[PDB]
Amino acid sequence: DSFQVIKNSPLSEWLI
Amino acid sequence: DSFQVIKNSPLSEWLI
Amino acid sequence: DSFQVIKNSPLSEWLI
Amino acid sequence: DSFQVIKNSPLSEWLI
Amino acid sequence: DSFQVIKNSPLSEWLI
Amino acid sequence: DSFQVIKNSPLSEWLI
Amino acid sequence: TSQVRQNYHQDSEAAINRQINLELYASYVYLSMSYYFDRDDVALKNFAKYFLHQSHEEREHAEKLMKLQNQRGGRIFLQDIKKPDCDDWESGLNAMECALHLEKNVNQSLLELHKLATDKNDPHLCDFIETHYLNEQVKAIKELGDHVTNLRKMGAPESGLAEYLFDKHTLG
Amino acid sequence: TSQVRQNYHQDSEAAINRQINLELYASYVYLSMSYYFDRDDVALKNFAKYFLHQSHEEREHAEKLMKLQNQRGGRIFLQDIKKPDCDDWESGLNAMECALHLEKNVNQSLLELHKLATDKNDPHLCDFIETHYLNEQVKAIKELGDHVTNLRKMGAPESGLAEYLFDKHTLG
Amino acid sequence: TSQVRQNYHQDSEAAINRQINLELYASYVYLSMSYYFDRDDVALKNFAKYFLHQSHEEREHAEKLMKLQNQRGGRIFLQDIKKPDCDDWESGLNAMECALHLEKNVNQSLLELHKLATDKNDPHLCDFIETHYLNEQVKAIKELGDHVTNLRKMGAPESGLAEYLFDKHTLG
Amino acid sequence: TSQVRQNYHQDSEAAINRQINLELYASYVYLSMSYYFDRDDVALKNFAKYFLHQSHEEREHAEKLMKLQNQRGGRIFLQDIKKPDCDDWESGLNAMECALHLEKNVNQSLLELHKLATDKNDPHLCDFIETHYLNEQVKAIKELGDHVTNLRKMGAPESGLAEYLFDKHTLG
Amino acid sequence: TSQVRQNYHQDSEAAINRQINLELYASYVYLSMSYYFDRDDVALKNFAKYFLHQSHEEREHAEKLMKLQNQRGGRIFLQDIKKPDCDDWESGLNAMECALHLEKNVNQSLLELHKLATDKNDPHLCDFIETHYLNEQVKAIKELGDHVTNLRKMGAPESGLAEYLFDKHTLG
Amino acid sequence: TSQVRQNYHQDSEAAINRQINLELYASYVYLSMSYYFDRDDVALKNFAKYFLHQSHEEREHAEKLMKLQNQRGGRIFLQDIKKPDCDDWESGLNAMECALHLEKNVNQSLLELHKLATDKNDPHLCDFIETHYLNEQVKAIKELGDHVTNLRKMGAPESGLAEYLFDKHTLG
Ligand SMILES: [Fe+3]
Ligand SMILES: [Fe+3]
Ligand SMILES: [Fe+3]
Ligand SMILES: [Fe+3]
Ligand SMILES: [Fe+3]
Ligand SMILES: [Fe+3]
Ligand SMILES: [Fe+3]
Ligand SMILES: [Fe+3]
Ligand SMILES: [Fe+3]
Ligand SMILES: [Fe+3]
Ligand SMILES: [Fe+3]
Ligand SMILES: [Fe+3]
């Protein structure tokens, strides 16, 4: 459950 | 900042 | 000759 | 089954 | 400068 | 052929 | 922007940051698995040792992705490491089933991570996943597959003797 | 016809060619046995290792008959290696029963191969079977006989614990 | 409730769980410190190596508290590991100042953790903090204090030569 | 169907089974090559030793594909190993020409096997062919190419001295 | 035309010949860099030693491409090695900037060389670039990136002490 | 102009720069010789190894002249390295004849280089040529002279056995 939340996160939330 | 949030947490939030 | 017979075999003959 | 087929083969089929 | 001259050379100048 | 071209070059072409 | 950045997309940069959290999250689940079997009412030493090794292995997978982001000119962005979804594991077999289901999820994320490098025409990033992550994710799933099938053949989790003997002969 | 051929019958020459296929066929069955126990739903490592050794042993038995045919002046004739008769083995006990039934069939073929050399008055060929094949075929059948009787005493194939412990203590 | 639980308060049990997150959080900050100095525009190898060692040291401090909770009969409760408060460190001196300010905060949490065991009359828990945590928290603060005072004597962070030479002679 | 099966197509599974027969067939041809040069009227010991090594190398290539099918969750399907197409080789040069023509055929089958994994978007299978099969198939063809060109420079197969000296200096 | 040529395009053959000149040209620039720092008015021994190693490394990269062309059945075509574009380097920092700008240009040529093998469906050539050239071109650019950023932090090229200390601690 | 320049003429300085190109050109011809014998249709391994050693020997002769120019206070001037005059060598004997004709040309250039130092009254430069270049150019020509005369005695290049045996016994 917590694994798919991180996986489905848009790429804009992982850029500085 | 994030260190004091965990430190000030009540003990009831750390018991199973 | 015998090498191309095996090579040209359809994939259906190699599944269980 | 396949073992007895080879075993029962006549000797003429094993000479060059 | 000399690096791009070699790099931009057509492939026909590098075959025997 | 290419060896004598370099060898016959005047010394003025080898000074900085 | 970086002086060493060449043929490195923002989408590939952001996908590496997401993968770093996924390996850091995975080591957190393996850390919660190891110390469950250290409990007095569980008491399976080689099960705890096995999941402790898995915890320090997912940490080095996250550290290697953090190192790869620096060579390509990208900038690491860190987020919260979420807590494991389960605070209690039913047994040794149930933990190997939740670890098999975890590795298959990690492997799925690498496949689309490899599918993004290919679309971006990033051949160096494609070779980095194939050499360090794709090959080891298949042995991990295969090994956990063997462990699960050897557990419910002995009669686990109903048989407490089954867990004890697997903990001794296989994991030890 | 060969310059080194002396006291070598065509019937003895043809019987050696038939035996070469029988050892090559036997190693093919042991190859299919080994990688059945490597499967994820079987996962018996020392069963796979045991049948892998048997596969490379029947190959050297076929290579020694190929070498013996050259010293006696005979000419090797090769045929198709047939596929194993079973593509699925029920369990570890069922594989040891199909391997015991296989060795007894190989031993039977050597007995009439020894009965043909004697009729042909070929004393060198008789001694070659007795030294390299007859002695090792009785230890092989005896060893597989022990393995089968130790499996259905523990309760195999119904007991999955029986296969796992035999795989560890006996085969490992 | 646990069969091995004796003289172990719920408040002491809950305070250990809070401390486990504090060491896990601390290793996350040291992980973000190490790979900042691995960046191409920073490029301080022994600064990255120094904070990488600090990262694996706070992980073993969290693992030893996880192990202590099992011996006393307590149950580990895990929460989110929060991301570090800073994603960029100004320089090597600014990182040593944020690491000195971090260790002093960790030491403060152990002092009230020791003040709770004493109030609960838990002498085994008091000796566990004094032996494994109180002594090493003073050397850590003292060592970081030396590092900070040796950096702004050379002229850091204005002097880029100061960081480079400290990285070579002191940290290397 | 398999618990460890992930991103594995039936077409990729069936293509691996076909390749296993192709390596098993190749080792059968090398086995018939080795014992042709062991014949009394041929008597080339290092030619027999060279093709004997090639026989045990194609067997390990078939065993590695059998092992790869188990990790990916596929099921091995075995067929007849066909007899070699030639029961007599004209000479040492003619055998190196029939072995060069064999390796080029094996290499062709791997290229379309790599072209099927790419179409199926199977990046793990693509890397398995490139690492273990594509690199070694080019050295094999190159080495056999050297051997053939060094044989008809000496005057083989007309010159029996040419075969004898190549057997000594090159193959020995 | 070659007996060992299989799945090898003329465009891939011609692109390898172009790459051979690019590595031979690169070693010529590193040769002119090394002996600039050997000059009496420069006198930086470990700068000369560093660029001398880079000179013999680009020569082995050109020799490995010359060897790869022979295994694939291609024919090497050699052209003039052009003289370096600069006969004087301003300083140690200016040389590391002209070497960083050189490696990034070499890496760019490999990316389109990898993009041509993929278009030609040459999977062996793709794996040869990824294993031997793509991985080492990123460490080279990263390492030169570190060296440049550590030079203008100390105050180079204005500070002659900065070059001398970097030459001692880092390059020595 | 240089602080270490003493008794060093411009003509001697320019003649050293010309010699550096002549050794760099010579190693380029030996590089094209080595990889011609690596070809599949040539396949002479010890001929390729012999000319590969000659390639790395002419590079050190050019590096020693580059080093000598720095000690005497001269400045290195680099030009294009011209491609070898022949892209195909008829045989092993034809390559040894083109290498003998090359060394005799290199030796001629050193003789007038020694004749210029003497005219300039440069005794240090005269001793540098005699110690490092004049002595080794006579052994090189003598050794290549032996190799050529031993090749056309066996019947090369008509005899392909002659090249193969010389490649084994002499060059190997
Ligand atoms: Fe991982
Ligand atoms: Fe893993
Ligand atoms: Fe046998
Ligand atoms: Fe046997
Ligand atoms: Fe601590
Ligand atoms: Fe600490
Ligand atoms: Fe193979
Ligand atoms: Fe091969
Ligand atoms: Fe390179
Ligand atoms: Fe490089
Ligand atoms: Fe020389
Ligand atoms: Fe020489």
Author numbering:
A (entry chain B), B (entry chain B), C (entry chain B), D (entry chain B), E (entry chain B), F (entry chain B): 484 to 499
G (entry chain A), H (entry chain A), I (entry chain A), J (entry chain A), K (entry chain A), L (entry chain A): 6 to 177
Cite, word for word, the article reporting this structure:
The interaction between nuclear receptor coactivator 4 (NCOA4) and the iron storage protein ferritin is a crucial component of cellular iron homeostasis. The binding of NCOA4 to the FTH1 subunits of ferritin initiates ferritinophagy—a ferritin-specific autophagic pathway leading to the release of the iron stored inside ferritin. A central component of intracellular iron homeostasis is the iron storage protein ferritin that forms a 24-mer cage-like complex composed of two structurally similar, but functionally different subunits, FTL and FTH1.
NCOA4 interacts with FTH1 through two helical segments connected by P493. The first segment (S485-S492) consists of a two-turn α-helical structure that is capped with a H-bond from S492, and the second segment (P493-L498) consists of ~2 turns of a distorted 310-helix. NCOA4 is anchored to a cleft in FTH1, which harbors these two helical segments. The cleft is confined from its sides by FTH1 Helix C and the long B-C loop; and from its bottom by Helix A (marked with capital letters in Fig. 1c). On FTH1, the bulky R23 residue in Helix A bisects the cleft into two separate regions; one holds the α-helical segment of NCOA4, and the other holds NCOA4’s 310-helical segment. P493 bridges above R23, thus connecting the two segments of NCOA4 while avoiding a clash with R23. The guanidine group of R23 forms a hydrogen bond with the carbonyl oxygen of S492, likely contributing to the stability of the NCOA4-FTH1 interface.
